[PDB]
Ligand binder design. Structure first.
Ligand SMILES: *P(=O)(OC(C)C)OC(C)C
Ligand SMILES: *P(=O)(OC(C)C)OC(C)C
Lengths: 377, 377
């Protein structure tokens, strides 16, 4: 713990002084043992308010593993089935292929991002999704989940279900499925199916306590810029066009629940979900848990470049040398566009979590490689 | 801050190493700015559950400043008056002196602990209070508050109201007064008068969530020992006889609300109350707030030893030199038998709070002195 902590603080120190990072919370656990848990920098720069260990964060796509857990809990109960048509819960969600014909789309297709659906951020302004007014769930729009999914369903699939991999709005679709299966709003279903059983008390989809939050920033000069609603921040090289951010979304009760991007939570609560995934203390049936953590897409998918497939929850490390990383094979990893990154190195019993208020440094920037390297040095 | 954090952490590190402390949460604020907010050690040693900044604690006499604020909000509202007889709300509460006379007992006498009332703990086994079966509010008994106050009123007062100082069940009497004055149970009344206006979201009288709590231990060698209901633990020299602990009391709905010992809360919520006392942003009328923080008893009362009197909320430091402390005159201070200590050094704008699960080290032990000294180093 002592040497690791020195390496990590060195990383963070440099990052803060070089104005690459406003503030972060990072946790390292090994076989359920906390080796590092620290707040870094500021939560609200303008107010001079320091980051705290239990500061709340908008999770963006760190939401996906939590909502995927909810879907799997319903599968374990027999209320969903991996091979069932999505139309059993969403009768009008019938996207068509480019030739006009309608394929079968299963719950499995959606969890693995192999259904053919996409995201606005893939190509941005003037794209199909753009013309159709489809929301990625990070911006604030005046319509509900049903209306976004109607719009989504009117777009052509990128390929036939099961024949490709593409990151997508599938978890926003699965959010609606969960609501229909449970007969509850998505916030309540997630609470019942995942957060309460795991002891996650500080997470949800809408908050009324802005003073507890990490204020979002995006990369800039000569210092990170404080986000305001409506802004379009371009994605790096090989990560997509852009993202349209609304920091106020988390506080608006009329923001539809986005299963792919819409939750908030503390670092401790996210760690509780990652640990349940890592260690499966009777949270899911053993065969279903193993399937969810196994690559279900293929290395050909290159979901975060070469050597990575995809399971039901995240990318899955297939080839460490091809991916250029010290992580061991079997590692689980994903992130979030507000500036977060996490991985579970299953062989080492390692859960590593980084939540930040700086998009995109904490998602894909040098910060993330430097911290990962520090953990394995 | 970085400096203060290192000095404070070294004190905790040694306390933990020597096994004089299982776990704690401490906070130092200066003129409204959080300088230090840290969890240390374990909440539940046997389960290996670490302390968290939001861990809940049984507050013991840290209840008193919060219930006293409830009383003072009623006074400001005109529903109580400092000068009024307790009998205007508790007609049958008529303690007598050792001659037979029924003296005047006012709200002022209770708030200051100058009424003549006492505690079982002052004498313990075999005493008058023992013979009458009077409870200090920390153990679990099969009767309600009205029954405990009937027993209490049957004991003779120790001295004439206003003629001396003696730590007492007076805040438990005042809890009953608040119930009569508001027509609500004490928990609901405190919630309305104090916790809601001050944003104290994680406090109360009865909890259904044991997994959130710090488990109570008592001092011991080689290590502190986990308490069970009904055990008796002698108090430190010059502190009284003993305390009978019932850790399950906070989870039992049938436990009467004790205004002097009965609440639970988090460190943050306690800090909100202490800050309200310290800076009074329109929470109470200025003259009443000043009266409450002013010595109403005199240095002679030696309430924390020589140099200390008492106001309406706590001890008040009159003479630092006599008290052998670096704290400034005017300092407010009190504690709790589950292992807690707090003070407000008004001159320095300082609020300092220690909540622990180790009776009595976190209340009166070397730990409290070493922490105090590091703050002022
Ligand atoms: P998420 O935060 O994406 C949202 C914009 C839906 O994940 C990143 C890796 C694209
Ligand atoms: P409180 O926690 O105690 C009575 C309820 C017995 O503490 C005082 C003695 C400071």
């Amino acid at each position: 713990a002592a040497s690791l902590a020195a390496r990590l603080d060195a990383v963070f120190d440099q990052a803060l002084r070089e104005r690459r990072l406003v503030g972060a919370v990072a946790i390292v656990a090994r076989h359920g043992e906390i080796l590092y848990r620290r707040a870094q920098g500021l939560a609200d720069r303008e107010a001079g308010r320091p980051m705290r260990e239990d500061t709340l964060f908008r999770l963006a796509s760190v939401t996906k593993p939590i909502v995927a857990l909810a879907v799997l809990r319903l599968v374990a109960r027999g209320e969903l089935a991996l091979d069932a048509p999505v139309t059993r819960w969403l009768p009008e969600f019938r996207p068509r292929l480019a030739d006009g014909s309608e394929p079968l789309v299963t719950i499995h297709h959606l969890l693995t991002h192999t259904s053919g659906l996409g995201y606005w951020l893939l190509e941005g302004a003037g794209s199909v999704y753009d013309r159709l007014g489809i929301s990625d769930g990070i911006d604030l729009r005046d319509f509900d989940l049903d209306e976004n999914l109607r719009r989504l369903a009117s777009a052509p699939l990128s390929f036939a279900p099961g024949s490709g991999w593409q990151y997508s709005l599938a978890l926003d679709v699965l959010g609606a499925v969960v609501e229909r299966a449970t007969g509850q709003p998505l916030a309540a279903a997630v609470d019942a199916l995942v957060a309460q059983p795991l002891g996650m008390r500080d997470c949800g989809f809408v908050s009324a306590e802005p003073e507890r939050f990490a204020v979002p920033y995006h990369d800039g000069q000569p210092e990170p810029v404080r986000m305001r609603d409506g802004i379009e921040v371009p994605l790096p090289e090989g990560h997509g066009a852009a993202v349209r951010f609304a920091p106020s979304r988390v506080f608006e009760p009329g923001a539809y629940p986005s299963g792919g991007a819409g939750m908030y939570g503390s670092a401790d609560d996210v760690l509780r979900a990652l640990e349940a995934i890592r260690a499966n203390p009777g949270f899911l049936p053993e065969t279903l848990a193993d399937a969810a953590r196994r690559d279900q897409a293929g290395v050909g998918a290159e979901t975060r470049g070469p050597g990575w497939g995809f399971g039901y929850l995240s990318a899955v490390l297939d080839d460490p040398a091809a991916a250029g990383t010290p992580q061991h094979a079997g590692t689980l990893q994903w992130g979030g566009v507000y500036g977060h990154s996490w991985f579970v190195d299953r062989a080492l019993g390692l859960s590593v979590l980084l939540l930040t208020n700086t998009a995109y440094e904490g998602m894909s920037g040098p910060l993330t490689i430097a911290l990962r390297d520090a953990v394995y040095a």
